[PDB]
Amino acid sequence: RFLKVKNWETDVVLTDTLHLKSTLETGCTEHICMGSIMLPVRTKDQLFPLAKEFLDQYYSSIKRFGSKAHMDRLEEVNKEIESTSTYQLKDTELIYGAKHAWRNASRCVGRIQWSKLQVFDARDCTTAHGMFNYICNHVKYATNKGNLRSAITIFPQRTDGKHDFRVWNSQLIRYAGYKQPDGSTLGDPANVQFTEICIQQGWKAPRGRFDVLPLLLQANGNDPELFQIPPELVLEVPIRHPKFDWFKDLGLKWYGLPAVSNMLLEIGGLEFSACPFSGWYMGTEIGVRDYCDNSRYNILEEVAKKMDLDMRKTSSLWKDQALVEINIAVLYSFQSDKVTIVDHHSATESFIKHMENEYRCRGGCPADWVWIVPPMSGSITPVFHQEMLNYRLTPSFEYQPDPWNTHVWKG
Amino acid sequence: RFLKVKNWETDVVLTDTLHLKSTLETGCTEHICMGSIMLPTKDQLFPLAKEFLDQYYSSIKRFGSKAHMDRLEEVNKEIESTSTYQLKDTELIYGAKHAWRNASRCVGRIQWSKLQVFDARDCTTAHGMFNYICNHVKYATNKGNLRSAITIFPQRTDGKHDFRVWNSQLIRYAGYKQPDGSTLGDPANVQFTEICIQQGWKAPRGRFDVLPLLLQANGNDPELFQIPPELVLEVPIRHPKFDWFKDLGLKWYGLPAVSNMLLEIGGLEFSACPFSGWYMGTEIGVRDYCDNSRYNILEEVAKKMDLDMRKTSSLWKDQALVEINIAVLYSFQSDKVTIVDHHSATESFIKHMENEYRCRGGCPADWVWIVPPMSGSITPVFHQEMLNYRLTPSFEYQPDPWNTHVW
Ligand code: HEM
Ligand code: HEM
Ligand SMILES: Cc1cc(N)nc(CCc2cccc([C@H](CN)Cc3cc(C)cc(N)n3)c2)c1
Ligand SMILES: Cc1cc(N)nc(CCc2cccc([C@H](CN)Cc3cc(C)cc(N)n3)c2)c1
Ligand SMILES: C[C@H](O)[C@H](O)[C@H]1CNc2nc(N)[nH]c(=O)c2N1
Ligand SMILES: C[C@H](O)[C@H](O)[C@H]1CNc2nc(N)[nH]c(=O)c2N1
Ligand SMILES: [Zn+2]
């Protein structure tokens, strides 16, 4: 069956056949849409089917479907599974897998870049120290002195689920948050709980507004260990405004490298529970969400206070007006320091071309509208007007519970 | 089956049970979410009637009473005998109120129960329709202090006798393609405006011409009526700080009045049921003025503001978008015409969700539509998980009548 999406701005109509390769569930039924819901050990039993699907895909992509190399590999994986109960990906399959998990990430607006991804194979890693070294190298390579490069580091796969590699941090680089006796938070309220675990695990907290958190690393199902990223490796950008000279005096900065470290990568039924990946920021992630969410740095008040806006009635749109300035400032700052960043007009335009290209070459592009539309100025971006179909393809990135909820302490 | 919705800003979790009364289907499956697609006989009628009368008699705390059974009996007998039935005024009013209560795309539902229902089921001619619509327009405008209203024309009979308002809204601006290649006035209405000209309308060929009504009574061919100009309240758009803004020559109408939808109550279909409330500011300032396919005024405004339009990253679009929206709100408040900003509206809707969750077990809500088209994440609805499902009575989209009419 064919499925058509419409763009209401351009009248362009696309036909999706790729959704037919969807297996995983959406959360929705014919009676309920869960489109705005945030979160909606395998046996050889289910494993070989998942292995076979993946290797068929992989072999198709390299124009070798049905080849002797294809059949041989199938046969080899088959036996490894029934013999060892799992299997090892070849390098080329790991790289292709990781590229495709990104490609299939329907909440990611940056996917025009999916084929340019540096994969680091950290499957020989055995210890937390080993994980720390791998992660440092990723940070350094990805940062590239401001000329950011997409990268992922892939640590050993789940085996019995009792020996998982995990990065406890949700991102490689984030700022500490400290809940105060008076109820106020210092630093980033999103990280209070993780900051507290770090402190518990022995970290001496500077207790400032922008303290880079230490890494908390679990290898082989062992208790996690703390490591501070060399400060010289953590690129940061002071935020100033092109026209407002007082903007610098708000004392704002942000780090350059958005690097997600809490997600699970699935390739051919194998589960990679520690697979940190990084790209570059879209300006709004920082300027809109990190700075302006009420549950985050919540700076709207101070900025509008400094801009002398009419703050008595919301209908003055003082919030909206301060929000644009904060975002101009983020983009200005990153650009001035030559740190890669994309604005939300440019990111969304690119995504639309990528998406159309995906329909032409691939028969679809799964896309989550709730996430793809930027959290400011929604309708003046082309994605607002774009009908999207959301469905789940593997390989994929999945959410996992935070490891402190599941971890069995060895002590 | 018992479902939770979380707000990520506040950690408030609500439990939805109302969805388990979900009647119609979504477009979504276990395999594919269609959350962002805009458009996803005697036998059938009696369960539809019963289900509705059950909810009605439940609402007036009389479920299982003799008056309940007696009406269920009467409607039964009426359907078997006549192949349809008529709602009592009370049932009609309850039904209209609930179609609004159930409109998952409507952010303004905190108001759902203050709705003026005008029963136009006695209407027989397009002139009658015009009279009814003028009175609606006048009552709702109320010299700028807008009041919610719906006017309900006769229900579908055999489908060859539909009442329809051909306009999508009671009040809209004409659109004309120019030899110049561009578009004059509102490009959204170009096709309708041609049909008006072709049915006789004499267009002033101006940028803000109020379209004529095109009214279809009893499945007959539609007729043209101009709404009395003195009933169409309009607002010139000025900025509280940019003196030059007025020179753009922008105005908008005060009355948002949807006239193209289908009201379904207890299985009955009211195909002409224009309804109206009041505007949320972003509807005009963000969508009507700034959509590339609409009045598309961003560039001209940005230029007057002398912003750096050289690169997208200066956020000149965003900067000008904000001003355009300050101006809409400012003008409406200055001319004392009801308008709500998106901060206030979405805040009201969060309070409404809360009431609906405790009082009713949920609230069908479509996030894609509820989150304003500007500054999404700084309004509380952005952070609010919502479940979308279809409850009856309902407003349903229906195809533009010109694609369906036998002339
Ligand atoms: C190239 C630079 C990139 C840009 C500008 C970009 C943009 C974004 C943005 C704006 C989001 C939404 C983030 C949020 O609001 O939380 C996102 C989500 C996502 N991105 Fe991309 N991205 C980029 C690179 C990548 C890379 C390299 C991967 C993996 C290889 C990736 C996979 C994802 C996934 C899995 C999510 C959803 C994560 C979640 O649900 O928490 N992105 N990206
Ligand atoms: C009180 C003033 C009102 C406000 C501020 C309000 C707010 C809104 C907004 C912002 C939308 C989205 C419309 C769009 O973006 O095109 C909407 C859609 C809708 N509203 Fe309300 N509304 C109000 C009154 C009403 C009334 C009185 C009814 C029914 C009697 C109603 C039923 C609907 C329906 C059915 C839709 C979806 C229309 C469609 O799908 O095209 N609204 N409303
Ligand atoms: C590679 C990459 C590039 C880029 N431009 N941005 C990012 C930021 C990703 C990010 C940062 C913070 C928080 C989040 C996500 C939410 N924005 C974290 C999250 C939370 C929940 C509840 C579910 C879920 N699936 N995900 C994503 C990553
Ligand atoms: C009563 C009322 C109050 C208010 N504040 N705004 C409105 C605006 C309603 C409106 C105006 C213009 C256009 C539209 C809708 C689009 N925003 C028209 C439409 C188009 C399609 C394809 C599907 C669909 N379900 N609807 C709705 C109505
Ligand atoms: C409840 C709702 O799904 C939630 O707030 C989502 C909305 N859209 C989003 N979009 C992006 N890119 N990132 C987010 O964190 C969210 N949050
Ligand atoms: C494709 C997408 O569904 C479409 O652009 C929607 C998005 N959200 C919307 N939200 C509202 N309130 N009104 C609209 O017309 C739309 N358009
Ligand atoms: Zn859905």
XYZ file of C-alpha atoms in Angstrom, chain B residues 7-168:
162
model
C 3.448 17.413 31.790
C 7.255 17.701 31.567
C 7.395 21.240 32.905
C 5.414 20.476 36.077
C 5.577 16.677 36.532
C 1.789 16.603 36.853
C 0.492 13.233 35.597
C -3.200 12.807 34.630
C -4.979 9.501 33.962
C -7.174 9.275 30.911
C -10.189 6.988 31.059
C -12.404 8.957 28.660
C -10.700 7.526 25.586
C -12.261 4.149 26.332
C -15.527 5.673 25.203
C -13.768 6.547 21.914
C -16.107 6.041 19.020
C -14.524 7.048 15.651
C -11.068 6.068 14.239
C -7.844 8.167 14.129
C -5.884 7.369 10.953
C -3.073 5.968 13.116
C -2.189 2.300 13.471
C 0.231 0.238 15.582
C 2.608 0.683 12.623
C 2.188 4.288 11.571
C 1.330 7.535 13.311
C -0.633 10.063 11.238
C -0.679 12.707 13.955
C 0.443 15.338 11.402
C -1.907 14.563 8.481
C -4.541 17.384 8.162
C -7.200 15.002 6.720
C -6.795 11.369 7.973
C -29.317 3.944 6.927
C -31.935 2.905 9.539
C -29.715 0.270 11.209
C -26.663 2.436 11.896
C -28.829 5.296 13.193
C -30.421 3.670 16.239
C -27.216 2.788 18.074
C -26.009 6.310 17.249
C -29.227 7.818 18.720
C -29.137 5.544 21.823
C -25.469 6.195 22.615
C -26.166 9.931 22.441
C -29.431 9.895 24.452
C -27.672 7.748 27.031
C -24.998 10.395 27.470
C -27.661 13.146 27.536
C -29.805 11.513 30.207
C -26.654 10.791 32.120
C -25.626 14.476 31.952
C -28.948 15.545 33.544
C -28.573 12.840 36.265
C -31.549 10.863 34.899
C -29.888 7.774 33.432
C -32.278 4.818 33.660
C -35.289 7.001 34.553
C -38.693 6.548 32.921
C -38.224 9.888 31.041
C -34.992 8.347 29.638
C -36.650 5.087 28.561
C -39.690 6.957 27.196
C -37.536 9.129 24.913
C -35.413 6.169 23.863
C -38.703 4.453 22.971
C -40.046 7.528 21.092
C -36.892 7.971 19.027
C -36.905 4.266 18.308
C -40.469 4.423 17.023
C -39.696 7.601 15.067
C -36.662 6.060 13.308
C -38.489 2.876 12.300
C -41.384 4.943 11.019
C -39.645 7.988 9.520
C -36.059 6.755 8.917
C -34.743 9.666 11.024
C -35.661 11.606 14.151
C -35.707 15.145 15.497
C -33.762 16.407 18.499
C -35.547 18.242 21.281
C -34.179 21.769 21.736
C -32.507 20.624 24.939
C -30.814 17.743 23.123
C -29.738 20.019 20.274
C -28.157 22.509 22.670
C -26.380 19.798 24.667
C -25.177 18.244 21.399
C -23.782 21.502 20.031
C -22.009 22.254 23.288
C -20.447 18.784 23.359
C -19.251 18.838 19.737
C -17.218 21.865 20.860
C -16.236 20.188 24.108
C -14.960 17.268 21.991
C -13.065 19.349 19.367
C -9.536 18.077 20.054
C -7.897 20.766 17.910
C -9.534 23.651 19.806
C -7.445 25.444 22.385
C -10.391 27.639 23.408
C -12.577 24.923 24.926
C -12.517 26.328 28.460
C -15.466 28.290 27.074
C -17.316 25.269 25.748
C -20.387 25.625 27.886
C -21.020 29.332 27.256
C -22.317 28.817 23.714
C -25.349 30.510 22.224
C -27.197 28.021 20.081
C -29.484 29.407 17.370
C -31.971 26.836 16.198
C -32.457 27.444 12.481
C -34.093 24.066 11.793
C -37.200 25.877 10.538
C -35.174 27.543 7.781
C -36.260 26.658 4.188
C -34.644 29.114 1.725
C -31.287 30.701 1.075
C -32.817 34.051 2.025
C -33.857 32.556 5.353
C -30.264 31.347 5.709
C -28.975 34.811 4.978
C -31.318 36.325 7.619
C -30.256 33.753 10.215
C -26.549 34.297 9.424
C -26.768 38.102 9.661
C -28.415 37.790 13.076
C -25.741 35.362 14.168
C -23.007 37.701 12.981
C -24.596 40.671 14.771
C -25.279 38.772 18.041
C -21.756 37.313 18.167
C -19.901 40.543 17.320
C -21.856 42.462 19.981
C -20.033 45.734 19.137
C -16.664 44.044 19.694
C -17.409 42.280 22.931
C -17.627 38.919 21.172
C -19.882 36.096 22.273
C -19.692 32.445 21.175
C -22.476 31.194 18.928
C -23.629 28.467 16.566
C -26.558 28.540 14.078
C -27.898 25.073 13.136
C -29.662 24.678 9.799
C -31.859 21.616 8.946
C -30.201 18.145 9.151
C -29.239 15.974 6.152
C -32.262 14.070 4.856
C -31.531 11.858 1.850
C -28.322 13.764 1.051
C -29.818 15.353 -2.079
C -31.264 18.171 0.079
C -28.292 19.442 2.046
C -28.035 22.923 3.475
C -24.521 24.305 3.018
C -22.692 27.568 3.452
C -20.235 27.552 0.540
C -17.827 29.916 2.269
C -15.295 28.284 4.660
